[PDB]
Amino acid sequence: DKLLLANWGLPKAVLEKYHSFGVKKMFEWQAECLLLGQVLEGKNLVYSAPTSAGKTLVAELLILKRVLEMRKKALFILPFVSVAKEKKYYLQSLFQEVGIKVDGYMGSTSPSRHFSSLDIAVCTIERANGLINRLIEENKMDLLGMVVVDELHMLGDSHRGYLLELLLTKICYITRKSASNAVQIVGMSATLPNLELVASWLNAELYHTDFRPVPLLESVKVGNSIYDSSMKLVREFEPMLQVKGDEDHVVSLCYETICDNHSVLLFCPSKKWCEKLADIIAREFYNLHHQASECPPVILEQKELLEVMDQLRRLPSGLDSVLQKTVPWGVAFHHAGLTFEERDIIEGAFRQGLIRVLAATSTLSSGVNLPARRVIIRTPIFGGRPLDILTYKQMVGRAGRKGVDTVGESILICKNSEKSKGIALLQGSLKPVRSCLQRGEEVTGSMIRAILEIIVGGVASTSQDMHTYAACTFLAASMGAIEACVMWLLENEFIQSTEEGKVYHPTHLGSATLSSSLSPADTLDIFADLQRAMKGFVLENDLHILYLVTPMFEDWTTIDWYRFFCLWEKLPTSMKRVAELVGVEEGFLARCVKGKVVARTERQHRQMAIHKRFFTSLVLLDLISEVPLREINQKYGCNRGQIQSLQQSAAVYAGMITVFSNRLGWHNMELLLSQFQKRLTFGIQRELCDLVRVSLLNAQRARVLYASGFHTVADLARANIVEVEVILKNAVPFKSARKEAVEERRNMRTIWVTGRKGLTEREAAALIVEEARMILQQDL
Ligand SMILES: Nc1ncnc2c1ncn2[C@@H]1O[C@H](COP(=O)(O)OP(=O)(O)O)[C@@H](O)[C@H]1O
Ligand SMILES: [K+]
Numbered sequence: 199d200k201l202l203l204a205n206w207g208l209p210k211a212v213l214e215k216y217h218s219f220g221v222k223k224m225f226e227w228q229a230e231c232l233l234l235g236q237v238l239e240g241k242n243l244v245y246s247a248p249t250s251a252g253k254t255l256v257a258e259l260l261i262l263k264r265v266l267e268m269r270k271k272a273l274f275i276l277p278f279v280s281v282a283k284e285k286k287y288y289l290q291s292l293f294q295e296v297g298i299k300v301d302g303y304m305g306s307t308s309p310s311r312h313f314s315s316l317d318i319a320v321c322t323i324e325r326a327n328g329l330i331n332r333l334i335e336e337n338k339m340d341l342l343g344m345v346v347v348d349e350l351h352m353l354g355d356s357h358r359g360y361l362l363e364l365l366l367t368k369i370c371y372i373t374r375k376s377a378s379n380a381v382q383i384v385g386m387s388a389t390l391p392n393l394e395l396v397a398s399w400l401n402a403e404l405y406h407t408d409f410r411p412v413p414l415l416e417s418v419k420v421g422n423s424i425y426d427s428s429m430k431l432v433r434e435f436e437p438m439l440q441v442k443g444d445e446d447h448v449v450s451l452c453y454e455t456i457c458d459n460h461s462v463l464l465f466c467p468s469k470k471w472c473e474k475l476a477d478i479i480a481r482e483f484y485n486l487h488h489q490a491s492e493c494p495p496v497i498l499e500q501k502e503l504l505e506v507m508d509q510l511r512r513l514p515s516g517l518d519s520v521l522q523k524t525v526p527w528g529v530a531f532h533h534a535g536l537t538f539e540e541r542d543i544i545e546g547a548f549r550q551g552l553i554r555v556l557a558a559t560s561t562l563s564s565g566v567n568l569p570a571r572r573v574i575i576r577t578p579i580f581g582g583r584p585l586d587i588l589t590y591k592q593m594v595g596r597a598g599r600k601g602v603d604t605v606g607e608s609i610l611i612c613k614n615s616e617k618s619k620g621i622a623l624l625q626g627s628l629k630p631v632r633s634c635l636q637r638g639e640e641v642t643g644s645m646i647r648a649i650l651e652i653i654v655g656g657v658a659s660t661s662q663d664m665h666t667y668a669a670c671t672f673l674a675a676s677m678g679a680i681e682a683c684v685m686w687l688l689e690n691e692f693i694q695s696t697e698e699g700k701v702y703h704p705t706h707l708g709s710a711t712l713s714s715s716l717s718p719a720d721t722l723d724i725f726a727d728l729q730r731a732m733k734g735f736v737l738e739n740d741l742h743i744l745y746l747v748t749p750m751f752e753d754w755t756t757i758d759w760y761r762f763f764c765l766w767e768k769l770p771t772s773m774k775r776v777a778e779l780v781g782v783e784e785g786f787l788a789r790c791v792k793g794k795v796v797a798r799t800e801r802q803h804r805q806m807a808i809h810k811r812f813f814t815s816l817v818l819l820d821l822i823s824e825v826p827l828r829e830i831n832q833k834y835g836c837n838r839g840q841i842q843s844l845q846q847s848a849a850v851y852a853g854m855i856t857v858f859s860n861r862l863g864w865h866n867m868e869l870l871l872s873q874f875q876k877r878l879t880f881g882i883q884r885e886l887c888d889l890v891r892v893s894l895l896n897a898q899r900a901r902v903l904y905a906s907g908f909h910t911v912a913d914l915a916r917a918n919i920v921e922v923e924v925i926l927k928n929a930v931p932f933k934s935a936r937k938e939a940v941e942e943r944r945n946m947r948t949i950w951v952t953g954r955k956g957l958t959e960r961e962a963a964a965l966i967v968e969e970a971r972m973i974l975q976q977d978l
């Protein structure tokens with residue numbers, strides 16, 4: 199009665215966009231989450247709910263509550279680029295009927311529109327923290343109205359999860375310096391034990407629920423028997439048609455689900471098991487339906503299965519060999535070895551029902567929202583080690599489709615030996631959230647950085663302000679070291695002290711580090727290395743420049759050293775000079791092949807990182823030399839997933855080093871670097887830099903249009919559409935040495951986009967020419 203959406207004083211225009219697919223009434227917990235306290239007035243809120251319970255609607259009503267009531271700008275923060283991109287389009291579609299402009303600041307991407315001409319900016323953690331820093335230097339902190347944090351449990355421990363605290367703490371420190379509404383915080387996560395601590399730290403009202411529209415049946419199978427969390431038998435399983443192999447009834451379980459016209463997610467430890475399992479299942483699906491690499495069977499969807507394989511074909515990766523076998527039978531795999539474009543296709547196919555069986559890794563469990571009737575976990579041993587509890591809850595959470603299934607079933611297959619360990623996961627619970635700013639060592643990276651941001655930014659100047667900040671931390675909410683970090687910044691010339699007793703100021707090295715979004719620990723080695731490059735620099739190739747923008751803070755692949763030594767001998771003299779100039783000794787490469795001795799316990803054995811870095815720069819060199827992804831894979835021995843993940847990392851890092859050089863006055867160095875951020879992003883040469891401004895144009899399409907007479911956007915705006923269409927048809931990779939009168943493919947949507955409607959080769963060509971024209975006019 200009262201939770202009817204029409205009784206909340208909702209604008210009429212918006213109320214219908216929600217009703218497009220469901221959403222006429224809310225939930226018991228969503229109405230209570232809004233009404234209790236002074237939350238709807240602007241008070242901060244930290245709420246928890248089970249996965250697939252409707253956490254999105256609660257935040258959205260609060261965001262619209264501020265954008266339209268306070269006429270201020272909102273900030274939506276998401277962990278990954280893939281989940282951030284998924285959220286942007288979902289929010290764009292909802293917030294357009296009232297003239298509300300919504301874009302995003304994600305990974306290497308940047309908005310065409312000014313921050314002043316937005317309403318809601320969608321960011322990742324790294325990019326959001328930088329944007330906040332943008333607002334401090336310009337004192338435009340007054341623009342920001344609220345921040346929404348998704349996955350609040352990443353506050354605890356992550357490669358970047360600590361940035362979430364510095365971000366929030368900075369907001370808590372600033373809002374304290376003005377101490378009617380100020381800055382509202384809406385955080386949400388899974389059930390945390392110390393969740394009450396987070397609500398108190400942020401002075402937020404709390405809400406927690408266990409509600410879930412579809413009941414989840416977590417279970418564990420040992421042999422034929424299936425038990426619940428209390429080891430009580432709930433089903434004695436017997437396989438309808440036996441097949442050979444390992445067979446812990448894995449194929450029979452998948453078959454049972456499909457026959458009831460449903461879909462199943464099958465999680466496997468390694469990337470190789472997923473492909474092997476997708477192959478076995480798809481192979482058995484061929485024999486069993488008929489009782490004894492094709493076209494999809496004739497149903498209502500014959501057209502869409504064909505559209506999917508063709509979209510895969512017209513990609514920079516091509517159509518995977520294993521997928522060509524499996525996809526025709528609604529079977530596929532999904533891991534980090536695949537490119538981000540392949541994974542966007544499969545996730546969409548599975549979400550539409552085109553793919554009924556999806557054998558995935560742990561990458562998907564933390565990825566986008568993707569539900570299924572039955573979830574199967576192959577083993578409690580992932581990567582040779584027992585499975586993490588959070589990963590388990592993320593896998594089994596995808597069981598049960600709201601509005602479709604009566605229940606969601608989860609099966610964890612085990613042996614008698616790993617029997618005890620499996621039950622531990624079903625009964626297990628999440629660990630308490632750590633501060634990631636902790637003291638053995640008096641100093642720590644996260645703390646040094648937090649202090650640098652507030653001093654250089656100019657919101658903490660004196661010594662009293664520092665301890666005022668210490669009160670606002672999540673670390674102090676749980677109930678010196680700060681003074682140690684300040685001295686560290688003094689010793690390394692990051693900060694200044696003047697004689698009005700004891701006031702701290704930023705140096706040029708300080709102001710440069712902040713604007714570059716670089717870590718103070720990393721800045722020291724970078725600053726010395728750059729000065730080293732400017733004393734003796736090679737300009738005949740782009741290798742030495744690439745080395746300066748080649749990131750080595752994390753391993754992106756397992757390098758085969760014997761292959762490396764083989765490429766070393768074949769390496770031209772111009773690139774050997776660059777190798778020597780960097781630190782690459784041939785003796786060390788030999789000592790890598792002969793014995794797999796990593797050593798690296800000693801700190802001066804950063805010698806290892808150097809050879810790893812030079813190996814990586816070679817890969818980046820071919821990448822911006824427009825070498826096919828398939829050649830690079832065979833040449834170096836790394837998958838297309840690792841390469842693409844690397845270039846998006848190097849594109850970002852290249853921008854940092856460029857800014858770092860600009861703030862230090864190093865013009866000559868800046869001048870050389872300022873061309874590789876764009877080239878690393880798309881993986882192109884200098885000529886294609888202009889073409890790739892068009893959204894639909896990537897490296898391959900840009901090359902074939904360049905080789906056909908269209909060099910610029912200007913050349914592309916006067917262009918004849920049907921000619922562009924023909925040129926596009928020529929860039930496609932076919933298995934036979936390719937490149938029936940079918941008047942039925944005049945409508946086949948075989949071209950993929952972002953936030954996509956299926957595009958035909960004709961519409962894509964017409965969109966490219968239309969977009970080229972729109973850009974050319976804005977240039978005058
Ligand atoms: N109050 C609601 N009433 C009906 N359906 C909802 C409601 N909130 C969300 N949904 C739908 O349920 C699905 C899952 O909810 P979601 O908000 O994704 O939960 P979570 O964010 O915890 O995964 C979404 O696709 C959404 O369209
Ligand atoms: K593009």
Ligand SMILES: [Mg+2]
Nearest residue numbers: 249253348349
């Ligand atoms: Mg969520």
